[PDB]
Amino acid sequence: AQNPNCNIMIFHPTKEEFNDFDKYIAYMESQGAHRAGLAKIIPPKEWKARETYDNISEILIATPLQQVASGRAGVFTQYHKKKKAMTVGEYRHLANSKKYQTPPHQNFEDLERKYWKNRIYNSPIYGADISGSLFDENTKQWNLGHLGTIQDLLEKECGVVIEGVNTPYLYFGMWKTTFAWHTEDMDLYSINYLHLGEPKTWYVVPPEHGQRLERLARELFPGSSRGCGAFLRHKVALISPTVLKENGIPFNRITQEAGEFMVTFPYGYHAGFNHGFNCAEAINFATPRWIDYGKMASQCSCGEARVTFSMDAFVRILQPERYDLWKRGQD
Ligand SMILES: O=C(O)CNC(=O)C(=O)O
Ligand SMILES: [Mg+2]
Ligand code: NI
Ligand SMILES: [Zn+2]
């Protein structure tokens, strides 16, 4: 078995190896990368996502989210308060303000210590989930707006033709902006490219150990657990590395820097935070190996997680028993 200790693997494809996305994913899995839940891909030195970022300030963040925390430093939830629209130029200036900027620090480890010590006492503003792409249309390799669609994968593997589309999303972050513990919708893959700015630290639980994270989460968030059988789908819960270590949960951590890709694998729980002003682009995708994870994915039926038009069809085809009760949550 390759990668038996489920370590995060880092890949350095050549420009020749960067031509065939699907084949490269299958390569990485042949080396055991999926066992970690997360992998890093450093693009060939010749590759670029676009020529410059000089003209992005006029993108609109229509609903910036203020991430308000409750709990204790190592075990907290966050609620997203909607703010007034602002441009990316306005958001960058805010991120750089004395109130919101990254503190002085020695290295990524000291900054990580400061994040876990101090996150709950601040409410950073996250520009999340903005439909769009920053890849130049002439970028042919690993262009997250040109990937094969999940609906076409389901058709190729299973023969069934379904409605829905699959498009990327932009994330504009600042110091302390946080992504809660989650797997992807329908336990899909994700791919995430850090276009610019400061790093993003990731934490991940190997897929084979995901249920250990879930059991700890039910103990740490007991009222949420009683309310919903898949409450991590709400994407509000945070648990620190120290707490995970105290409870014996297997995990790994890695920091992504600008110019690098991360891939999350089916049923790889992940969480993390941004070090400062940055912009990431991410999209879900599928492979043949995903299908069985999609059939088994948990779902929120309390109604809080409230998810996409395209997820309807996935549920309808892969989980026809759940269909009914799940669309009651989504209607
Ligand atoms: O970058 C972020 O805030 C969150 N991204 C993801 O969870 C992802 O790419 O799967
Ligand atoms: Mg612009
Ligand atoms: Ni994710
Ligand atoms: Zn729910």
Tab-separated table of C-alpha atoms and ligand atoms in Angstrom:
chain	number	residue	atom	x	y	z
A	1	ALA	CA	0.000	0.000	0.000
A	2	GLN	CA	1.524	3.352	-0.967
A	3	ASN	CA	1.686	6.187	1.595
A	4	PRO	CA	0.492	4.039	4.554
A	5	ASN	CA	1.046	6.814	7.108
A	6	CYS	CA	-1.257	9.132	5.043
A	7	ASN	CA	1.304	11.930	4.752
A	8	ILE	CA	0.554	14.999	2.617
A	9	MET	CA	2.493	14.558	-0.610
A	10	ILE	CA	3.991	17.347	-2.731
A	11	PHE	CA	4.262	16.979	-6.514
A	12	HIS	CA	6.441	18.831	-9.013
A	13	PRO	CA	5.122	17.964	-12.521
A	14	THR	CA	7.103	18.860	-15.565
A	15	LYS	CA	5.427	20.939	-18.292
A	16	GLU	CA	4.977	17.706	-20.206
A	17	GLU	CA	3.286	16.023	-17.249
A	18	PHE	CA	1.032	19.107	-16.800
A	19	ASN	CA	-0.841	18.531	-20.037
A	20	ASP	CA	-3.208	15.846	-18.998
A	21	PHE	CA	-5.081	16.750	-15.796
A	22	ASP	CA	-6.939	13.491	-15.312
A	23	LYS	CA	-3.887	11.373	-15.943
A	24	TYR	CA	-1.859	13.422	-13.386
A	25	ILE	CA	-4.548	12.953	-10.704
A	26	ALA	CA	-4.523	9.220	-11.390
A	27	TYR	CA	-0.697	9.302	-11.097
A	28	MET	CA	-0.820	11.020	-7.760
A	29	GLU	CA	-3.279	8.428	-6.450
A	30	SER	CA	-1.014	5.595	-7.777
A	31	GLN	CA	1.571	7.078	-5.351
A	32	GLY	CA	-0.899	7.060	-2.444
A	33	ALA	CA	-1.538	10.822	-2.348
A	34	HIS	CA	-5.245	10.475	-1.660
A	35	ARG	CA	-4.605	8.682	1.555
A	36	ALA	CA	-3.649	12.013	3.159
A	37	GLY	CA	-6.889	13.778	2.056
A	38	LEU	CA	-4.820	16.655	0.593
A	39	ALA	CA	-1.912	17.063	-1.831
A	40	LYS	CA	0.174	20.004	-3.027
A	41	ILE	CA	1.030	20.499	-6.712
A	42	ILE	CA	3.759	22.976	-7.626
A	43	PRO	CA	3.237	23.946	-11.279
A	44	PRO	CA	6.102	23.772	-13.789
A	45	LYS	CA	8.269	26.857	-13.743
A	46	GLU	CA	7.213	27.717	-17.267
A	47	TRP	CA	3.499	27.867	-16.429
A	48	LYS	CA	1.482	30.899	-15.455
A	49	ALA	CA	-2.212	31.350	-14.599
A	50	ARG	CA	-2.333	34.743	-16.231
A	51	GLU	CA	0.112	37.488	-17.211
A	52	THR	CA	-0.465	39.898	-14.319
A	53	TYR	CA	-2.913	40.603	-11.454
A	54	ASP	CA	-2.727	44.337	-12.056
A	55	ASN	CA	-6.280	44.880	-13.013
A	56	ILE	CA	-8.403	42.893	-10.406
A	57	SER	CA	-9.398	45.665	-8.074
A	58	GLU	CA	-12.719	46.178	-9.715
A	59	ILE	CA	-14.084	42.722	-9.006
A	60	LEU	CA	-17.042	43.096	-6.640
A	61	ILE	CA	-17.460	41.201	-3.408
A	62	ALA	CA	-21.253	41.566	-3.286
A	63	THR	CA	-21.682	39.965	0.201
A	64	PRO	CA	-18.495	40.088	2.302
A	65	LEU	CA	-18.850	37.869	5.393
A	66	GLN	CA	-17.706	38.888	8.883
A	67	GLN	CA	-16.709	35.704	10.682
A	68	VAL	CA	-17.800	36.052	14.295
A	69	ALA	CA	-16.535	33.329	16.655
A	70	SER	CA	-18.089	31.770	19.814
A	71	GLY	CA	-16.602	29.238	22.146
A	72	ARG	CA	-13.048	28.757	23.356
A	73	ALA	CA	-9.800	29.206	21.523
A	74	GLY	CA	-9.398	25.603	20.473
A	75	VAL	CA	-13.118	24.688	20.015
A	76	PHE	CA	-15.332	27.336	18.451
A	77	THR	CA	-17.978	27.997	15.926
A	78	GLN	CA	-18.200	30.902	13.501
A	79	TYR	CA	-21.163	32.688	12.190
A	80	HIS	CA	-21.122	34.697	9.005
A	81	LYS	CA	-22.588	38.169	9.266
A	82	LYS	CA	-23.332	39.738	5.886
A	83	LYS	CA	-21.715	43.120	5.162
A	84	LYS	CA	-22.195	45.746	2.535
A	85	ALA	CA	-20.654	45.193	-0.892
A	86	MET	CA	-17.171	46.267	-1.605
A	87	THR	CA	-14.652	46.002	-4.440
A	88	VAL	CA	-11.508	43.909	-4.246
A	89	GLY	CA	-9.566	47.232	-4.054
A	90	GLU	CA	-11.589	48.316	-1.101
A	91	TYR	CA	-11.222	44.851	0.530
A	92	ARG	CA	-7.432	44.804	0.036
A	93	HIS	CA	-7.166	48.207	1.702
A	94	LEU	CA	-9.261	46.917	4.601
A	95	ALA	CA	-7.172	43.775	4.930
A	96	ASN	CA	-4.035	46.023	5.127
A	97	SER	CA	-5.531	48.297	7.811
A	98	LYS	CA	-4.108	48.364	11.281
A	99	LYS	CA	-7.263	46.653	12.629
A	100	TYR	CA	-7.105	43.661	10.224
A	101	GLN	CA	-3.501	43.235	9.102
A	102	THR	CA	-1.196	40.304	9.815
A	103	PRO	CA	0.822	40.829	13.022
A	104	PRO	CA	4.543	40.716	13.278
A	105	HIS	CA	5.732	37.143	13.414
A	106	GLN	CA	8.935	35.050	13.148
A	107	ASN	CA	7.824	32.341	10.767
A	108	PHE	CA	4.718	30.329	9.754
A	109	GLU	CA	4.782	28.355	13.074
A	110	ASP	CA	4.771	31.508	15.221
A	111	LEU	CA	1.891	32.887	13.076
A	112	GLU	CA	-0.002	29.576	13.529
A	113	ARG	CA	0.442	29.876	17.313
A	114	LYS	CA	-0.900	33.443	17.189
A	115	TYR	CA	-3.902	32.340	15.029
A	116	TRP	CA	-4.974	29.621	17.483
A	117	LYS	CA	-4.368	31.769	20.512
A	118	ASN	CA	-6.145	34.809	19.233
A	119	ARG	CA	-8.602	33.985	16.439
A	120	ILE	CA	-11.705	34.022	18.550
A	121	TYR	CA	-11.123	37.580	19.720
A	122	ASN	CA	-11.379	39.039	16.249
A	123	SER	CA	-13.932	38.974	13.361
A	124	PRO	CA	-12.092	39.021	10.031
A	125	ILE	CA	-14.015	39.660	6.783
A	126	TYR	CA	-13.972	36.907	4.087
A	127	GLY	CA	-14.943	37.416	0.414
A	128	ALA	CA	-16.015	33.857	-0.240
A	129	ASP	CA	-17.800	31.961	-2.830
A	130	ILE	CA	-17.719	34.518	-5.667
A	131	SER	CA	-18.529	32.890	-9.058
A	132	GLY	CA	-15.743	33.687	-11.488
A	133	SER	CA	-12.219	32.886	-12.669
A	134	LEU	CA	-8.884	34.594	-12.808
A	135	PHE	CA	-7.287	32.118	-15.258
A	136	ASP	CA	-6.497	33.592	-18.644
A	137	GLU	CA	-8.521	31.896	-21.338
A	138	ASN	CA	-5.278	31.147	-23.126
A	139	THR	CA	-3.920	29.147	-20.198
A	140	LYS	CA	-4.489	25.636	-21.415
A	141	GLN	CA	-3.029	23.564	-18.567
A	142	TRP	CA	-4.778	23.271	-15.173
A	143	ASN	CA	-7.157	26.059	-15.960
A	144	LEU	CA	-9.860	25.632	-13.320
A	145	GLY	CA	-12.467	27.161	-15.625
A	146	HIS	CA	-11.754	24.509	-18.363
A	147	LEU	CA	-11.973	21.271	-16.447
A	148	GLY	CA	-14.191	18.383	-17.501
A	149	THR	CA	-17.468	18.669	-15.591
A	150	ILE	CA	-18.766	16.409	-12.854
A	151	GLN	CA	-21.958	15.904	-14.897
A	152	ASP	CA	-19.854	14.664	-17.827
A	153	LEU	CA	-17.905	12.332	-15.484
A	154	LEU	CA	-21.157	10.849	-14.212
A	155	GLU	CA	-22.322	10.417	-17.791
A	156	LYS	CA	-19.084	8.769	-18.940
A	157	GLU	CA	-18.961	6.370	-15.939
A	158	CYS	CA	-22.649	5.643	-15.409
A	159	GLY	CA	-24.427	6.566	-18.637
A	160	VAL	CA	-26.879	8.960	-17.091
A	161	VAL	CA	-27.335	12.470	-18.430
A	162	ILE	CA	-28.230	15.120	-15.910
A	163	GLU	CA	-28.743	18.858	-15.723
A	164	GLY	CA	-26.328	21.144	-13.935
A	165	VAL	CA	-23.114	23.026	-14.458
A	166	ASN	CA	-19.761	23.140	-12.557
A	167	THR	CA	-18.014	26.558	-12.348
A	168	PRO	CA	-15.175	27.984	-10.266
A	169	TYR	CA	-15.336	30.264	-7.325
A	170	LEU	CA	-13.052	33.061	-6.036
A	171	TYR	CA	-12.079	33.582	-2.394
A	172	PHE	CA	-10.582	36.834	-1.163
A	173	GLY	CA	-9.031	36.435	2.324
A	174	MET	CA	-7.338	38.401	5.025
A	175	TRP	CA	-5.512	37.573	8.231
A	176	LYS	CA	-7.516	35.096	10.361
A	177	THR	CA	-10.164	34.367	7.717
A	178	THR	CA	-11.109	30.789	8.414
A	179	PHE	CA	-12.496	27.747	6.628
A	180	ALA	CA	-14.283	25.394	9.018
A	181	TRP	CA	-13.937	21.630	9.161
A	182	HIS	CA	-15.701	20.039	6.168
A	183	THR	CA	-15.640	17.667	3.304
A	184	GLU	CA	-16.838	18.785	-0.142
A	185	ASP	CA	-20.405	18.587	-1.284
A	186	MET	CA	-21.187	14.983	-2.143
A	187	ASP	CA	-17.624	14.193	-0.871
A	188	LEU	CA	-16.218	15.466	-4.197
A	189	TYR	CA	-12.615	16.413	-4.866
A	190	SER	CA	-11.659	20.045	-4.795
A	191	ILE	CA	-8.797	21.865	-6.445
A	192	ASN	CA	-7.663	25.198	-5.112
A	193	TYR	CA	-5.161	27.595	-6.734
A	194	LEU	CA	-3.663	30.426	-4.669
A	195	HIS	CA	-3.445	33.202	-7.287
A	196	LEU	CA	-1.766	35.837	-5.202
A	197	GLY	CA	-0.961	37.226	-1.816
A	198	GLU	CA	-0.228	35.694	1.516
A	199	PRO	CA	-0.302	31.976	2.386
A	200	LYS	CA	-3.145	29.657	3.439
A	201	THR	CA	-2.516	26.997	6.145
A	202	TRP	CA	-4.476	23.762	5.810
A	203	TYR	CA	-5.302	20.988	8.253
A	204	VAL	CA	-6.600	17.617	6.970
A	205	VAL	CA	-7.807	14.275	8.311
A	206	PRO	CA	-7.034	11.184	6.173
A	207	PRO	CA	-10.251	9.893	4.546
A	208	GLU	CA	-9.857	6.519	6.167
A	209	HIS	CA	-10.053	8.263	9.521
A	210	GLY	CA	-12.802	10.734	8.839
A	211	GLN	CA	-15.258	9.026	11.208
A	212	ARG	CA	-12.847	9.671	14.105
A	213	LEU	CA	-13.122	13.398	13.421
A	214	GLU	CA	-16.920	13.118	13.211
A	215	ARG	CA	-17.133	11.319	16.560
A	216	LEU	CA	-14.979	13.968	18.224
A	217	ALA	CA	-17.081	16.699	16.636
A	218	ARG	CA	-20.306	15.170	18.011
A	219	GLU	CA	-18.732	15.219	21.526
A	220	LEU	CA	-17.470	18.836	21.135
A	221	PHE	CA	-20.585	20.261	19.570
A	222	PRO	CA	-23.277	18.142	21.208
A	223	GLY	CA	-26.375	20.305	20.605
A	224	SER	CA	-25.465	20.719	16.910
A	225	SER	CA	-25.084	16.921	16.697
A	226	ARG	CA	-28.571	16.398	18.083
A	227	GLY	CA	-29.990	18.937	15.602
A	228	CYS	CA	-28.497	17.373	12.470
A	229	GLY	CA	-26.951	14.060	11.642
A	230	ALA	CA	-24.422	15.722	9.304
A	231	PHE	CA	-23.843	19.035	10.983
A	232	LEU	CA	-20.293	19.457	9.702
A	233	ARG	CA	-22.055	20.231	6.393
A	234	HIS	CA	-22.930	23.535	7.939
A	235	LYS	CA	-19.266	24.533	7.730
A	236	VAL	CA	-19.122	26.410	11.031
A	237	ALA	CA	-17.044	24.265	13.389
A	238	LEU	CA	-13.426	24.746	14.300
A	239	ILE	CA	-11.171	22.408	16.301
A	240	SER	CA	-7.505	23.255	16.859
A	241	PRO	CA	-4.508	21.020	16.230
A	242	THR	CA	-3.876	20.918	19.974
A	243	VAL	CA	-7.383	19.611	20.608
A	244	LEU	CA	-7.110	17.081	17.822
A	245	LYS	CA	-3.734	15.853	19.317
A	246	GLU	CA	-5.285	15.673	22.830
A	247	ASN	CA	-8.067	13.414	21.419
A	248	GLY	CA	-5.833	11.215	19.256
A	249	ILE	CA	-7.297	12.275	15.890
A	250	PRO	CA	-4.939	11.630	13.010
A	251	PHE	CA	-4.268	14.827	10.953
A	252	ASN	CA	-1.679	16.671	8.955
A	253	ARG	CA	-0.943	20.302	8.216
A	254	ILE	CA	0.669	22.169	5.363
A	255	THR	CA	0.958	25.798	4.206
A	256	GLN	CA	0.079	26.707	0.606
A	257	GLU	CA	1.830	29.699	-0.962
A	258	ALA	CA	0.920	31.835	-3.935
A	259	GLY	CA	1.369	30.013	-7.190
A	260	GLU	CA	0.614	26.579	-5.778
A	261	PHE	CA	-2.331	24.154	-6.207
A	262	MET	CA	-3.905	22.024	-3.506
A	263	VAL	CA	-6.155	19.047	-4.218
A	264	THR	CA	-8.564	17.709	-1.589
A	265	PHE	CA	-9.695	14.108	-2.023
A	266	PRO	CA	-13.065	12.509	-1.446
A	267	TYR	CA	-14.009	12.465	2.180
A	268	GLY	CA	-10.844	14.359	3.265
A	269	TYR	CA	-11.967	16.664	6.052
A	270	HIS	CA	-10.076	19.949	5.927
A	271	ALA	CA	-9.958	23.349	7.689
A	272	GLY	CA	-7.589	26.246	7.644
A	273	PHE	CA	-6.873	29.949	7.711
A	274	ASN	CA	-5.337	32.755	5.661
A	275	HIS	CA	-2.162	34.552	6.723
A	276	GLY	CA	-3.042	37.889	5.129
A	277	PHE	CA	-4.625	39.409	1.994
A	278	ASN	CA	-4.918	36.741	-0.701
A	279	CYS	CA	-7.011	35.448	-3.571
A	280	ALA	CA	-7.735	31.761	-4.251
A	281	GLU	CA	-9.814	30.067	-6.916
A	282	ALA	CA	-11.380	26.644	-6.354
A	283	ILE	CA	-13.726	24.200	-7.993
A	284	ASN	CA	-15.058	20.734	-7.299
A	285	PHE	CA	-14.289	17.823	-9.605
A	286	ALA	CA	-14.782	14.101	-9.911
A	287	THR	CA	-12.967	10.989	-11.076
A	288	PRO	CA	-14.194	7.437	-11.410
A	289	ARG	CA	-12.999	6.668	-7.910
A	290	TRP	CA	-15.279	9.417	-6.502
A	291	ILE	CA	-18.525	7.686	-7.540
A	292	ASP	CA	-18.692	5.388	-4.623
A	293	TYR	CA	-17.952	8.232	-2.210
A	294	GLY	CA	-20.749	10.194	-3.697
A	295	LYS	CA	-23.184	7.334	-3.088
A	296	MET	CA	-22.151	7.236	0.578
A	297	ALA	CA	-21.891	10.931	1.303
A	298	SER	CA	-23.757	12.229	4.342
A	299	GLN	CA	-26.294	14.830	3.947
A	300	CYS	CA	-27.725	17.716	5.973
A	301	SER	CA	-31.550	17.380	6.042
A	302	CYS	CA	-32.083	19.928	8.986
A	303	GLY	CA	-32.021	22.402	6.182
A	304	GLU	CA	-29.179	24.607	7.302
A	305	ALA	CA	-26.541	23.612	4.700
A	306	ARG	CA	-28.737	24.565	1.737
A	307	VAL	CA	-26.786	23.662	-1.411
A	308	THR	CA	-26.565	24.075	-5.186
A	309	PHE	CA	-28.746	23.439	-8.072
A	310	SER	CA	-26.254	20.913	-9.426
A	311	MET	CA	-26.076	18.903	-6.170
A	312	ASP	CA	-29.797	18.069	-6.639
A	313	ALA	CA	-29.119	15.821	-9.502
A	314	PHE	CA	-26.210	14.133	-7.835
A	315	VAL	CA	-28.461	13.233	-4.900
A	316	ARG	CA	-31.250	12.175	-7.169
A	317	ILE	CA	-29.120	9.731	-9.148
A	318	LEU	CA	-26.607	8.499	-6.556
A	319	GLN	CA	-28.833	8.612	-3.463
A	320	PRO	CA	-32.426	8.080	-4.662
A	321	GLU	CA	-33.633	6.900	-1.232
A	322	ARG	CA	-32.369	10.083	0.435
A	323	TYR	CA	-33.786	12.240	-2.371
A	324	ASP	CA	-37.264	13.078	-0.958
A	325	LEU	CA	-36.039	13.849	2.683
A	326	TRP	CA	-32.964	15.842	1.448
A	327	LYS	CA	-34.983	18.091	-0.916
A	328	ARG	CA	-37.393	18.710	2.033
A	329	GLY	CA	-34.322	20.277	3.723
A	330	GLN	CA	-33.630	22.184	0.482
A	331	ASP	CA	-37.218	23.529	0.013
B	1	LIG	O1	-9.916	28.473	0.448
B	1	LIG	C1	-10.906	28.376	1.195
B	1	LIG	O2	-11.413	29.266	1.993
B	1	LIG	C2	-11.710	27.127	1.325
B	1	LIG	N1	-11.384	26.193	0.203
B	1	LIG	C3	-11.718	24.913	0.254
B	1	LIG	O3	-12.310	24.346	1.245
B	1	LIG	C4	-11.352	24.056	-0.896
B	1	LIG	O4	-10.666	24.456	-1.852
B	1	LIG	O5	-11.847	22.934	-0.782
B	2	MG	MG	-11.035	44.694	-12.036
B	3	NI	NI	-13.132	22.564	0.814
B	4	ZN	ZN	-28.045	20.270	9.010
